[PDB]
Design a protein around this nucleic acid. Structure first.
Ligand SMILES: [Mg+2]
Ligand SMILES: [Mg+2]
Length: 89
RNA sequence: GGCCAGUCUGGCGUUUGGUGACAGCGCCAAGUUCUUCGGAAUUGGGAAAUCCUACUGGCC
């Protein structure tokens, strides 16, 4: 399906491959921006062709809510979303 | 399959650039060429091409 804001992804291509990240912006049907709040923080988020990601069936409500209510997300909240995702899987 | 734009010796490491193939950086190796023997240049196949294998992105 379509990538969603706050969705967890596994990077499959690029030098950041095999890491987990969070979708923080959907440019169009092909390109997104991802960030993990650690080695790739929001202010320098990584542009990605969606075909170079694997969509994981987990969407963080805290990240999605933070964009709706505040228009942005903190690196702290990204790190929490990923750390919480890894614990449940 | 067609069209357009790209990538290149191998291994390990990589908070850097790139959507990506990759590149850059550190280390160990390999091929090619040159050498004043101290070293120097270079890296898919090709003498080379609007050429070709593989691979990457886009359109169909
Ligand atoms: Mg190289
Ligand atoms: Mg193609």
């Amino acid at each position: 399906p379509s990538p969603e804001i706050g969705q967890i992804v596994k990077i499959v291509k690029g030098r950041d491959r095999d890491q987990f990240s969070v979708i923080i912006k959907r440019v169009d049907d092909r390109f997104v921006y991802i960030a993990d709040g650690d080695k790739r923080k929001v202010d320098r988020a990584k542009r990605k062709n969606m075909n170079h990601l694997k969509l994981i069936d987990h969407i963080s409500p805290e990240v999605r809510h933070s964009f709706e209510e505040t228009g942005k997300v903190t690196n702290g909240k990204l790190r929490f979303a990923l750390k919480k995702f890894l614990e449940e899987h």
